[PDB]
Design a protein around this ligand. Structure first.
Ligand SMILES: [Co+2]
Ligand SMILES: [S]
Length: 163
């Protein structure tokens, strides 16, 4: 089913997720609900933290046709290099976008939806989305890289939006 996505200012967005202990049927349900939610919001990534589930689970699909499901359970950053940035959005910060510094390339290791370990080297948009989603799992939001004043204007506009 489609889950509720938390919006700033909600302190549960700052919670640090626990590792997943075993990828069982219940973990797979969460994964599937996460995709359903992400797609319904027209998103390209979602972290469990954003739907009040405090486990290290991320779903991503950067494809136009919404048929390239990437699941990152207990993701681990092995290496990163370069610098880049684009104007990022976030499902928990509606209608607000800002350029944020990110690594250009990342190499990560994670478990997939079957619990199988894999490694992934990503650049471009996918690398940026990976970093954005991993930030969520440690209670970090893209606005945290901006000036205290930008953060204020963003805080003020989301709060007025969710009227
Ligand atoms: Co986000
Ligand atoms: S997000």
């Amino acid at each position: 089913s489609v889950l509720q996505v938390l919006h700033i200012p909600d302190e549960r967005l700052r919670k640090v997720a626990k590792p997943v202990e075993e990828v069982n049927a219940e973990i797979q349900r969460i994964v599937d609900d996460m995709f359903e939610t992400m797609y319904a919001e027209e998103g390209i990534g979602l972290a469990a933290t954003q739907v009040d589930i405090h486990q290290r689970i991320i779903v991503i699909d950067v494809s136009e046709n919404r048929d390239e499901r990437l699941v990152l359970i207990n993701p681990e950053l092995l290496e990163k290099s370069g610098e880049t940035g684009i104007e990022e959005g976030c499902l928990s910060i509606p209608e607000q976008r800002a350029l944020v510094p990110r690594a250009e390339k990342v190499k990560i290791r994670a478990l997939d939806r079957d619990g199988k370990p894999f490694e992934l080297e990503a650049d471009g948009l996918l690398a940026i989305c990976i970093q954005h989603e991993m930030d969520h799992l440690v209670g970090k939001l893209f606005m945290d890289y901006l000036s205290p004043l930008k953060q204020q204007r963003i805080r003020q506009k989301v709060e007025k939006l969710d009227r």
